[PDB]
Every structure is written in C-alpha cells, then in structure tokens.
Amino acid sequence: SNIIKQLEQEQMKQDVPSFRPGDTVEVKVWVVEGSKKRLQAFEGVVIAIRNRGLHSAFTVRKISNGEGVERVFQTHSPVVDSISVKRRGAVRKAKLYYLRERTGKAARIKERLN
Amino acid sequence: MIGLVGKKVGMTRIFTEDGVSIPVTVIEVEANRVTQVKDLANDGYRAIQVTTGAKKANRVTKPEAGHFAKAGVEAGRGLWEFRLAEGEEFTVGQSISVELFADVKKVDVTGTSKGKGFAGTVKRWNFRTQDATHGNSLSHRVPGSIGQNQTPGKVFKGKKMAGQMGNERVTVQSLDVVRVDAERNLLLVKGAVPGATGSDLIVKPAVKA
Amino acid sequence: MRHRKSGRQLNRNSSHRQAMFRNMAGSLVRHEIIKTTLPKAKELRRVVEPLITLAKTDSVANRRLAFARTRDNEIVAKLFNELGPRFASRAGGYTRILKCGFRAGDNAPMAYIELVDRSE
Amino acid sequence: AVQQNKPTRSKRGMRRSHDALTAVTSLSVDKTSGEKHLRHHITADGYYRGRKVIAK
Amino acid sequence: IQEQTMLNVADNSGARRVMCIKVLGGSHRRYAGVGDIIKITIKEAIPRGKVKKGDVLKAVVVRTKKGVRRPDGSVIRFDGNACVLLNNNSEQPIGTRIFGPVTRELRSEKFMKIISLAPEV
RNA sequence: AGGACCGAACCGACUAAUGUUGAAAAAUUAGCGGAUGACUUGUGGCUGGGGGUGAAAGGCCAAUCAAACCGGGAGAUAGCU
RNA sequence: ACACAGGUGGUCAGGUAGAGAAUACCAAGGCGCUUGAGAGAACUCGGGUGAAGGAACUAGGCAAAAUGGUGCCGUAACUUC
RNA sequence: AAUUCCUUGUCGGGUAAGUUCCGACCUGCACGAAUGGCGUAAUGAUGGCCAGGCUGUCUCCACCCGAGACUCAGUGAAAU
RNA sequence: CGAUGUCGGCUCAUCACAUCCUGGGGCUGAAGUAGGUCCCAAGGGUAUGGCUGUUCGCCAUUUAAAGUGGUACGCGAGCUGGGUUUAGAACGUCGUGAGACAGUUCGGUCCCUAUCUGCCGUGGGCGCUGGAGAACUGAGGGGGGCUGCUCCUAGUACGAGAGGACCGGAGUGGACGCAUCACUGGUGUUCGGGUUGUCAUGCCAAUGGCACUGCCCGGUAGCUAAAUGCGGAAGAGAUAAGUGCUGAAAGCAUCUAAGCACGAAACUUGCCCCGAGAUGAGUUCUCCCUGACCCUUUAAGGGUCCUGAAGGAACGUUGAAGACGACGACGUUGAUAGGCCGGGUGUGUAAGCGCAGCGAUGCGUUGAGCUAACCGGUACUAAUGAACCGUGAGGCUUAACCU
Hints:
Helix content of chain E: under 10%
Number of helices of chain E: 1
Function (chain A): This protein is located at the 30S-50S ribosomal subunit interface and may play a role in the structure and function of the aminoacyl-tRNA binding site.
GO molecular function (chain A): structural constituent of ribosome
Shape of chain E: globular
Distance between the termini of chain C: 45 Å
Strand order of the largest sheet of chain C: 1-3-2
Largest interface: A-E, 16 and 18 residues
Strand order of the largest sheet of chain E: 1-2-3-4-7
InterPro entries (chain A): Ribosomal_bL19, Ribosomal_bL19_CS, Ribosomal_bL19_sf, Translation_prot_SH3-like_sf
Structural class of chain E: mainly beta
Radius of gyration of chain C: 15 Å
Oligomer: part of a larger assembly
Order of helices and strands of chain C: HEHHHEE
Protein name (chain A): Large ribosomal subunit protein bL19
Number of strands of chain E: 7
Keywords (chain A): Ribonucleoprotein, Ribosomal protein
Shape of chain C: globular
Radius of gyration of chain E: 13 Å
C-alpha cells in the first residue's frame, strides 16, 4: 500500500550488508543482563529468507557444544547491531533445510557472486 | 467520551529502542465531521452524528444530500453516531480528530468480523470431532446428540449448531494506543483488531479504563 | 472459505483445465472468433492475452515459451507473425465477449469471444 | 424419514407459493436495428448495440 | 513438551533418556516451555551415576525443538529437546556439569545456578 | 526331487472403508491366502426327497432345506386373532 | 427384470525399461463409459501434505504411516539336522 | 489351566502405575493318560502380552485436490 | 408382546442442592498456621494415565477442586459394538443321551433420501395509515461470570521455641472465549526448480503429455494454530446467613414490635451481541409528488385522458459478501473486474551464443529467465440509452393555537 511502508521506510536499517544463503555470516547481538549490556557473537551458515520488507529473517545454523542451534533474526531489529560476511558460499538452493540435518558436511566456497 | 471513526489499513510492527517489537494495527482516520447534534429536547438522549469519507456525489441520493447540506456540508461515505456524556460539541465538522485520541492511553475498537460464512460445529464452536478410524461410519465431524430423550422431548434454544460465523460486530476492549500523528492522519494501536482490510472501525476511549 | 482466490475450477481437474485452455486458446487464435460458455470465455481471455503479449516481442526464447504453452507450431507462427504486430499499438484488451442466448440442451449462458482486430 | 400424516393440498400449495417464475419486464430495442433483445446480449440478427458484431 | 515425550538429559548425574509423565502446574496443562518443571521417569541410565532406571523425579527443560520466542520476534530452536535433572523435594540439580547450550530464559531462582554451570547461555 | 520358496493369469475370501429404497437380492476399492497340486477348468453323464450328496457346517440339492418344487386329499384342523 | 461397476470356455501376444503375460508409456486397433452448465458452504466419499510429541487413541496399532530390488559382507535361542 | 467358584489367590518379572502377559507354589469348587497325558523344530489371514521403526490413531486439528450436496435447464421415483 | 433397541465408551449437554473448589458467617477442646462441625450461596470451575468390556475400584502423578444425584440407570432415525443375547467349535460340571450352565474360552451383517414439532442460520409477502433514504431510543433476550504461584506489607501480629498470619497492594502463569495474520510455522495439485521411465513435437538442442501433483525441494495471496493481542473486573442498589444501634410489650433484658445500619462470586445493574412483528408496530433528520373530467348505491367509490416524482428494482462488471437469496463496491459524470506497465515476492544464474575439457560437465553473459491470488498506476476489453415498478398532496372524531 502507499500508506503502509511509509512507516516502514524510516524503520528499516540502511546498513544491512549483502548476503545470500550458503554464507557463514557472523551476527553480533545485544544482550542485557542487568542495567549493563554486552554484545554476544553468533556465527554460522545462513538459510535466509529474501526480505519481505521491514519484516525479514536470517536463519543461521551453528553446532556449538554438539547441539545444533538455529536462531532466526529480524534483519531490521535494534537487537542485532552488526552482521558480517566472513565466508562466501555457493549452493544451488535458496533454502538449505535439507542440508541442515547432516552432520559435518559444509557448503563450499566460490570466489565471485556468492 | 466521543470516539472517532476510522478505516482499517493493515498491520505493521514498530521496533522500540529497547527492541520489544510490538504489533501495530494502522487505523486511517480522516477528519470526522459532525452532521447533527442531538439533545434532550429534540429526543431524550445526547449524541453527535458524524460522517467520514468522500462519496462520489452520483451515488448520494437527494435525501442524504439535504441532510449533508444542513448544518455544515461535506459528502461522506456514511453516518455514525456516538453518545456523549460530559461535554458539548458543535454542529459543524471538527478540524483534526486524532488529537483527542492523542492524550488517551487505552482505546476500545469495534468492527465487523470477517465472513467465515456457513461454518460447522468444529469451526464455529470449539467442538471435538469423533474418532477418525475405529468404525465411525459417516460421523467424523458431525454434531452429536442434540438432546436428552423423551423427558425434554425438544431441543433447547441455546443449542450450538452449524450456522453463519462472521459478519457481526465484535469489540476488543482495553487496547493500548501506540502513537498518534495528525499529519500522517493515523492512529496506531497494538495488536489484533476486528475487520477485513478496508473495513470501517469505531475506536472509542475504553469503558474499562 | 475462498477469500482473494482466483481461477475458475469449471468442475474439472487441473490437467483437464490446462488442456482445455490450450485447445481453446488455439482455436481462438486460429479462427479469431469462437463460441464458448461464458466462464470458459472469461478464463480463456485470461489465458489468451498473455500469449499475445508474449507474441508482441519476438525472439527464439519467446517462441519456445509460446510453444511450451499452446503446443502447436502453426498457432505459434500465426501469433508471432500477425497477432501482436497488429496489437503493437494496443496496451492490453485484445479480446471482446458478446453474450448470447442460452444453448438448447442445457441452460448455459453462451458467449462469443473474439479478437479485437479480426482478420476477417 | 416418512410422514406420519398426509400433507393437505393447502400445505402443498402454500409451499408451492414461492416458486412462481418472473417475467423479464424489460426488453431493449437495439440502436442500429429495431430489434427487441435481452439486455447485454446479441440480438441474434448479428447485432450488438453498435453494429453487426457477428456475421452469423 | 508433552506427556509421553522422551527427552535427553543435559547433566552428568541424570543419565541418558527420560520420558516426562506429567507437566507440572496447571489444571489441564498440555505443554511445557523451556522454563517449566516437569515430572520424568528414567527409561535409560548409565551404570555409574546416582540415578537408576525406573525412578520418578522432577526435571526442568532446557532445550526444545519448538524453541523459545524472544521479544524482538526472533526464535532460537534446537535439534533435540533436553532436560536437566532436579531433586523431587528441593528442585536443585542432581548433576554437577551441564552439557550443551542452555537458553537465557531461565534466569529465575535455582535455574540461575543451572546457568552458572551451563557452557553457553 | 518336493501336497518345497517368492510371485502374475486362475481359484479363494482374512481385514477395513463404501454401499444397505445399491451400480450389485452378497458387490467395488485398498491390502490378503494357494499358485505342479488332497490343484483349477470346459463338454457330457450318474445319484431324487425320511431320499441323494457331504475333508461333517444341519452344509448343498435351480436367489427355497431339522426335510425340495408342482399338482391333488383340500374349503385339513384352528377351544386363537 | 434393466443399453445392470457382477459371471462366461479356447486362440494370438509388437516396441522401450524389465526376470516377466508384473508394471509405466506406447504401435495395430478401439474407445471418451446416453444428462449437462454454473458456484466452489456445512457435511459425506477417495486422496495429498503437516510445527512439537509419538499409540498418550482404543476393546484392540482398527485404519494410515513405514518396509520393499540386485550383488557382496554378515546372521542368534532352538532342531525332527 | 481353553479347565480355579472364592479370585484382581500369594510371591517374583515387566511398567511411574499391570483384573491381561510370563515364571513360580498347589488349597485341582470341578486336570489326567488313544473319550488320550506331557513336551515339541517347522507352519498358521489363529488367541494373549512386550519392544524397535513408523506415523493425524491421538493431544488438536489445519489447508489443499477431485465426486456428490447448493443453483439452473431436461427426465423423474420411494417407503409412509 | 400387529416390537418402547440392552451395559459401557466417544460427541453434545441440561437441571436439583443434600456444595468438592472458590465467596460470606456462628461455635470451637479456634494462639498462629492448619483443621473439626454447622448455617447461607448453584455464578463459574470440577484431571491425565496403568489394569479390566467394565459402571465401580485399586494404583501412579497432578490439582484450587478432581462433588452427589435427575434427565427411557440423558443421548444407537448422532457414532462404536468390547460386554450381554442367535446359529460354529472347545474346556470343567451335570445327563445313558438329545442337550444344558447368571460357569469359561476363540469367531460372529447395527438400515432410513426428515413430512410435523424442536432447535441452528438466511430470505419472500404483508403490516405499522401518503410515498422514500438513513441514523437511533430500548420492552425484552442472549453471551461473560474460573483461578494458581511469587513479592511487598512481614519474618510484623501471634507464638517458650518451632513455625507463621488477618486486611490491602503489585506482578506472572493454567484451563476458557473473542478477534487477527505483523511475527513463528502448516497447507498452498493455480509459481519456480531438480530428476526417473516412456511417447510425441522431422532429428541435436529445447519443450509438452502420462505415470497419485510421477517422485521430490521450496514457496506468493488466502485459510489457519502451535503464533499473537484482548477479555471476563472496578464500582453502584436491594439482600441471604450473620453482626449491630436505639427501644418498648415485660420499670430489667432484648438486632424488632416502630425507626435505623452494615453484609456474598447468588439478585438488579455495570461489560459485549441481537433487538420496534415492542400489532403497545416508537423517535429524530432529510427528500418527493399539490392536473382535467364522466357516471353511480352517493356509510362512498369505479373508469377515462394527461403525468410518473423522490426512490426502488431488473441487467451487467464484481467483492476479504455468499449454499441460493441476502449484504456491500461500481456502471463510461467510470478504477467494478480482466488485460497492460512498473514494483514486490518466490524459485535460483532461463534461452541463445562463445570458451575450457576426450566426454560427462563446468565458466562468462548473469542474481539470469519465469512469476499466482500481492502493491501502485493506466480506459486497452466488458460494464448499452433506453425500458420496468412506485403517482398526482395523503380518512374520521375530539382538544389547544392562528385566522
């Protein structure tokens, strides 16, 4: 609509980096415990939706202590403060759910457009 | 207190600075125009009749055109009326309407529900289906017993059966306002609100508040 | 129930609907005027007009696409050579429906559907 | 699933009250040729309002 | 998350797989989140530990496949539910070492002392 | 080699659903058992009702069986409706 | 009883994939099943797919879901070998 | 116990929990030796119990694909 | 007895109070906490499994609580068919035997297209007194009515200690209900892709058909819970049990005889929905019609000419409206639907060519082609001008005002 997304244009971040599914991106997120707050890191292979606008999602998968953890992120949230590319990966699919259940199998790296 | 009338636009999220991400229903409110003021001498109740919209002036009939032309003119999409208790209002239109919802904290939203039509017992009420497998010839989703044998001999009036679900006024109470903005001409309320998109809503300051 | 859903089932399954609209689009492109039942004609125009718009810009890939749907080389040639070169100055609206009386066997609201620029 | 008593001819006619057909009440003469046709329809002389849209 | 749900055990003394047999609290409480205390029976057990197969006792969940929804709209989901064994009388953990990631939603009362032993919060 | 194994035609009929004024007066669908044998099938013949035939269930003997059908004694008898 | 989703003996037997007369698409050949047209409610029939749990359902794992080929490795209590 | 009325006998196993199952004891209401007793590999669309895999059986239902139901034109029954 | 289907379970309930919880009180051998017993109160709430066909009962683990009873021991033209209660077969017992048992064991066909009442939803006619468009008042009627844990007050009162409050506030849950799709997800046989067998498009290439959508991998709009917002109170009036003030009959006493004052989730309201067929048919605001005659009983009409108003309807394009009606948007003074253009979204680098490699295949062009129901515009197509219904100033009697 015209009138919706005028309220969203001010809300979306203009600093979101370019990503594709298959990359091993790293997300720094604000964690508060008391009055004090701290950045926590999270790095893993992404299974990201393409943006639906202000509403957006980056499902990032990482096996940390032997248990697989998949945590989605609103891309335009104030809780997420920095997303970094790190590795650049190449896959054919858009969603890597079939490539999430196997253990110790990693997406490859391609130099360009990935 | 009088409650202004609006049109549903959609739902959006507003991220707070903390990051709480509350849902928001955007209710577009044009400037309400008071058409007729009712007082105890003309009829024993107090109210203002309010129009909102812009009709095409080919679909307006002459009886509505004369009533619009009386007491300050603006063609509108319809007429509504809100009862009033403690104040006094003019017979002309008001200029900006959302600024009286500006100071308030909790609103009360009324609108028509979406038409689910002829819906059965399991969809209309929270009924249970009968079992899917162990026998059950032709009786999975069906209503069960509608009565109590011969001593009543009849079916009671409150008996829940299949019928129309939807297209009724449903009112959500104590809804919390997020913001107002006269220049964007909007009223933003947290969470779910009755209505299809493009349906007219009656937001009032909350009776429980 | 259905809300903001489009497409007419026409009391058919999906394979038969696609085959019908392939044959019906082919017959309309060939003869430039066919007689149909009314909802068949409405869905037929929703099928026919994208193929004519696809025929407006000629390339090998567009001909391969318009052979993938409507699956006949003569209709492909007729479209890409003389139906769309005529509608090049026209932006949409390549079809016109004229309601008629009801058919004699069953009361079906019957309607011609014709191309706006007819060769005949 | 059967009746216990026979419905009367009054009750049958009372039920048959609502299904009586309606006349169309309006026939539009076409502009180009003076043919009474149903509204938004071909006059079966080949004509819509403007012209002879179908040869047949 | 439900009656007759097998869960793994995230601590050392609690052993192998447990099945949870009642979701505690509530009149008809169908579901257990992350913070919620459940009643388990021990279906499988290692030989060494203090628990044994076939005893009733309490547990707190720590991980779910459904996961837990943060206020921003995000959800953190795991592959495999898990529970941390707690004593029946006092609800403190039996085990010494907590294994695997444990979420942030159990910052209340004894689950803080679970958090201190947890590797990743 | 095999009253051997898996499995189609063929014979059968354990389960569920649909039908129950049916598509069908015993069936359709999805599975199911036997499948070189005490198998299955075509044509013809024989056994006739206190009789036949029965790997035996009161089973079968023309949609009928603890006694077939058709005609006769016959308008049996009915302290019952 | 019927222009009836049932029953009826024998013969021939093309291709590709396949052990095959299974099965999938097809040659020769024959059909579209003697009411159609709309719309796309509850409810019923036949199917498809489901977050988390996995028989907690129930008289009962009834129904569904699963499993399935070829080659090789490997294979227990018991036994009339 | 295909046989036990008392009887859900008592003890043990399995389960968080077991009138069914399995192993025992023998107080056999009212087993028992070709009216056959006890055991038994293989077999069974056989009865009872348990485990794994699997799942809409279920918690708790949601959507979708078709055939009716609904509307129109034609023909047009039934028990009562 | 020319037929009233039998235990239990599933689905759905409704009622009584002889009340399980929650609400209020009296006594207590009631210190507190927790009880015991009795009175008032029916507003809401009142587990999940193991065993067994079981009702019941035992057992596990919950809960504030896991109430008692009526309704053909509620409900089989709503379901099941385990139990019982047909025909087969067997055990123990009885009988010489045919057979038999409230014994025991394996197997065993549950039909119906709703006429009337009754409910659940929707229309058509007429009425309401001239005819239309809306907006309301509220006689009524329905829905809702549950509650745990923690923290403060407060380790206060009480209590030797142990322990541990009344009243009043504040959060956070459990079941229930309404709404909605911004999020998390499901479905998404109408979008994209991968791939097997075969057939065709003359063959390579590229595609289409069929095999459940052939099998899968994702997924738009819509529908949706498992997701997300909100909600059952605050507060009034009159009370039940109770507790009272003043006060006599009866110089005292006494809550009562007079007068007065508190008191519960019960009653009447307060909240949400229907609602003037509320025939007692209500109110307010606006719009529209004020011409000629003829005959006739003249408790009054009928007919003819002229004119058809406001508005409704019919038809078409349609809808987050819908079984059909209905309701809502639009009809060229036009964005009502299809197409078109632009974006978005979803797949994931189309086709064509060229390069590399023996070839399978890879690379460049290139986040490329295709894109649904999405969003913003745009008259290209279909919404024809007529035509139809509805008229011509709206009865009598009485009372007030003007004349």
